[model samples]
Target: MEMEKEFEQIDKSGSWAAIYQDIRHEASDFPCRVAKLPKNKNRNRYRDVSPFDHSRIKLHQEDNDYINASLIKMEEAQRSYILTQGPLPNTCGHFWEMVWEQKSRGVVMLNRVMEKGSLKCAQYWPQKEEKEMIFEDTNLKLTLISEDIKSYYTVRQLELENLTTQETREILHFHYTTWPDFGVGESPASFLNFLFKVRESGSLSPEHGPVVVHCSAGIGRSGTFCLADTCLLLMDKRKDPSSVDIKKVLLEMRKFRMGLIQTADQLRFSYLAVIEGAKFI
Candidate 1:
């Protein structure tokens, strides 16, 4: 209740920007030695945003072991999410490799390939069902199986095959097509609707390893999505959804990754989405 009450007062006074600044100020600047190595420099999308060495995901390959992804585990909520930046063209293979190695059940993409006028992420998956994509680095083949399109999002079932073993697995691709570039979506209802759909799929449950969630930088919108989901999950089990300290949880998530929620608007939207979502809990 205190979190919601404080949110209401901040909403009335429009003080989200100040809170965002404080949040950033208090966030720890953990060492990122691996990400800075000359060999791993190109693997990062943005030089400023780096994953902590302790929480960074490791690839099984021998040559290099760095990727712009982090494993964020919310133990109390029983949620584990791998937050990563959009895959670079060269890194797309590593992206799929991480998926295969980690046994992630699904990929929740929150940004479009083309945003504004520039390329946000490489067209990492096959667009046409008949067409298939194979990466040399991992020999992973991806094919689109089926797609269900909604007004603001699209859910697709993709088939991932490891040519090495002639084995294959089904991966769910949940793409939110309408989120603005580096900003919150238009409304919480649609965002939460898509969120719940992903939830109802049971992909976020402990039964699975972890679901890969990504946006452009994988910190802003991606962070908000995980924070909201974790808060609501804690609320559902505790029967007091508002008790989870949104700021504290976000900061905890940040320890695993460099920056989780980026802007003031994003932070505020996370609260609003959680507040609106708690109604059902």
Candidate 2:
């Protein structure tokens, strides 16, 4: 089966809705540890986002630490990602705590602070106006080094320091500013270009800690990003894009984190992105 032909068939079949429902059906009734956390009600950014117990990212130092975050690993591609919700007012410190604890080198943000006049994410990083931000809860300080702005995205260099240990490390902040809420990017070329920019920096490589990937609730756009990246990597490795099963790959990814690829449109977009990305690989 040709890769382009496979995509054409799937697109023509119009079975995205069915596939999305099937994914939801399989993910239902799974035990979510973050939901079971004693403070789950308070930590979640949204009422719905929670991490499954099996792959939840747990904090070591703080007993009260709980965030809506999960560790998703793609063994075949040798890639790992921390899928998390956008930080809440109180959870901002915990969010940085996870970043420090996990030793993550990059934070991939797919949503803006405010979307359609609703607060989607807190101002977690240091703004140019503020210059620096402190997280008292985690005893960490974030200082902005520089920022590079593009038409649809922004790349920032930030220094994250642990107040207790006085140890500091640089962190990359990749913010995709123009992606619409509950929608895909403008096109696969633009999206893949951003993805490759991240890759070019070696931020998503195995040598670094799992890159933190998040949006508002962290499942819809976040999942789509990881899914497309993994499929494209597999295609590059196998030399046959059509041989990689997007459904199976997505389902496996969902096992490690919950509710990956949230909407029917997101699933459809994943296929399109994979198809387009294969050409470059």
Candidate 3:
């Protein structure tokens, strides 16, 4: 009753804009110095969407340690998510290296590799005709073992190996295909179903490293995904879904990364998904 009641009130009262403005101000001014370094400038997908230095994930490599990614940790829910931009061609190796170093078990990609007329992300993993690709930059190899294509999404099984040490691990790639490039998803029902599939796989447990979540900019869609999941997990733990505050939860998540839940519609979508998801909790 907590979140659901409040969400309906906000909708009926027509205060979506007020709520959006409140959060937008609170989340606006944070120091993100590292992302502006000259040597790291080209690594960013967009000029403004950069990770805050305080919580950005630093790669283990000595020569280049910068990547457009943030390690968002919701300690209250016992969850950690690596929210990052779609990989640049040069940073593809670093992407896998981060996965290797973090021991992440799954990658939840929320956008298409190529959108309408632009490149949303590098072909980071092997697909179609290719079975495997080696990254000489980080001495890593990614092999596509299997793929299951559904009507709206696709689940890929990838084997990631450290070529130098011969150590390897299987990675799950959950790609949601229907979400539009410019706005919120078409429906919350399909989005929640996709999320539950990832949950059922045990890829987002406390035992594993943070789940890597990304989109074109890794803010709007990625933030919505993380926020809904985090709030629902808290609701499940507390036994009172209303006890969780979606706005407060989002405020806390933004401290680690900048400009999450990109628009008023995305924020509204977050509320709708959380309220619907809380029923199952």
Candidate 4:
């Protein structure tokens, strides 16, 4: 079956939350909702990038019928975009782009991952020593502060239908809010275990780097990690401060960290942990 790529674009006046619901109108149609944010080129003023050779990273997962179908669909839709957009720039490329742009523009990269969740892939991702990217259905995204750095924090957007129930949705939300920081000894380890157990099983070999995650949009997961990574930078703060504008921090962290979550709902949810007395359910 040929699934038509739904085209919905948001501008300055539009709300990402509204656009998100519109785009996800068919969330109930699938087991999981998957979307990817296209890389925005014009972020800051003077961003520079150092070329990265990620050929060494080993991507793993099993192939099933659905993944194959999704890939074909994605390739058709993305061929022009990737080429016209100049091949999805590597993360490092994105980092550098922000760096160089910030040189001319002021520091403006958001430095946090606002939210995250898992896509339950029916087909197993391939497990190869030399891994291949699973194109199509899987990816994630995050939106940066456009020009003004007044945006709220970001988060991972999940298709409402993909979730089995409200509790599932809350679990996803809770995970992002309560997940561990990069520098925290238990946080990274917990994340690593959770990543493999929930998504796939794997050992990081010399050929592999940190896990590569994206949906049709990679921003959500990418952004979530960026936020967690930033947590490490904030000198041992026991609580995530509500006043800290995550989007503003991300703008300043353009090259060092690219905060990925940007949808209005996602951004709103990023504030889940603001209360000093909040506890996990």
Candidate 5:
């Protein structure tokens, strides 16, 4: 079976509703510790944005530090990603702390700082011309080295330094500025081109730490990106683009983070992007 044929089967099955229902059913069993951890009660950017207890990423050195982030590992595809929410004013330090602690190579941001007259994410990275941005809470410094502005996205080279240890790491920041929050991209071609740009940097490689992917809530657009990327990687690995099962893969991904792929439209978009992406690989 070819990928296109599998997509046709999926489209004909018309099981998106059923698939979504099953995801919802599974989400009911998902455990969340944010509510119990009183400190995080107010740390989350939004009341609804919380990490699942089982897969939550914890800060080892900070006793009370809890951020809405999950370490999603796709062992088969040799990819690992840290799915997290956009930084809040108070949690900005924690966001950098997690990045440094986890040793992430890059950040894949799919939302703008302000989208549609609403604040979708904080300006976490340093300004382009600015020398550096300091996070006093976490005792970290982010220095901007260079910036490349493209038609739909921006690539930044930033240096992250741990003030405590005086250790520094260069991190790539890939910001998809045009992706509307709670919505799909303009087209999969644009989306896949962005995905490949990240891949070309070797940020998604297994040798490096997980690439941090985030949106407003770190579920909807975030999930779609990871799903499409993972599925495409699987297709290439098996030498059969149709060997992977989209629904099964998504269920596995959701196990690491609750409410991934927030809408049926997002799931449908995943299918389109995955099928379109396979041709490139």
Candidate 6:
């Protein structure tokens, strides 16, 4: 049987744009960055000005295109959310971002949107080593397990759990530490430790399947992991180092959920994580 693909719906027409313009005055409270509507409506004529206190101005057309409120909505719908890159720079790691519907509460919870969902999640509070963290997905038969770290017991359990089933393929997990207090190599250590388990996971290769990762907000730790993994994919293709720019990768992430490695320390750790390649030695 073919694997199911989650489709991202987007309103490509100018209707979203017109709606944005209609509420342009109130755009300040729309939960995202904003700028002016184009003067030409179709062509790129208007300037990209900020709705928030009318701060900085984006001089180019591409810049204008990026800051538009309509584009923000479309990006979210298409799961193309990115991160903010200012004071720092661009990092070219892009991951699809989304706000999942809460079937129970009817209100979307941002934290739950990124983590792999399980009918019964064996959530280990404070996340100890060797604990089983199983999460159910839309298809319960194809169970998704969340166990990634440097613990031998946990790694073995993850593999054993999947191998027992004929239909299982993907298993996902993330490491989170309140460490990485912002200034130096704090988060990278956590990343390196997690990568050690990911290497052991064996099923982690892109060809094997997709992985779900999330932290407190699914931005800091989650974003860094996604970036390194993406770079590892590029390396797998034998691509040149010059072909990558961390800033661009980060901007794409910010466009989705704002504040992917938003702090100076997290950003710094992320830079180190991707450059180390997949070799955690």
Over 192-238, each residue of candidate 2 has an lDDT whose tens digit, in order, gives: 88888888888997888999999988898899889989988888887
**How far does residue 78 in candidate 2 sit from its true spot (Å)?**
0.9
Model 1 Cα lDDT, one tens digit per residue, 1-281: 56678888998998899889888988877888898889988899999888888889999987698998999988788788999999998999999999999998889999889888898888999989989899988889999999999898999999999899988989999999978665676569989998999988877777777999999889988998999998888888876655688888888888889889888989989998998898865
Q: After TM-score superposition, what is the CA distance of residue 175 in candidate 6 from its true location, in Å?
A: 4.0
| Tens digit of per-residue lDDT, candidate 5, span 65-159 | 58889988887887889999988887888899999999899999998888878998888888865657889988999999999999989999989
Clash statistics: count for each candidate: 0, 0, 1, 54, 0, 25
Predicted structure 3, TM vs. truth:
0.96
Each candidate's TM vs. the true structure? 0.96, 0.94, 0.96, 0.27, 0.92, 0.41
Error of 5 at 22 (Å): 3.1
Give the backbone clash total of model 5.
0
Cα error, residue 90 of model 1, in Å, equals 0.1
Please list all clashing residue pairs in model 3, or write none if there are none.
2-242
Superposed model 3: Cα runs more than 4 Å off = none
**Candidate 4 regions off by >4 Å?**
1-211, 232-244, 256-259, 273-281
lDDT of 4: 0.25
lDDT of each: 0.88, 0.85, 0.90, 0.25, 0.85, 0.33
Model 2 poorest 10 in a row by lDDT: 28-37
- The residue pairs that clash in candidate 5, if any, are none
Q: Candidate 3's error at 47, in angstroms? A: 1.4
**Which model is ahead, 1 or 3, in terms of lDDT?**
3
Cα shift from native, residue 250, model 4 (Å):
2.2
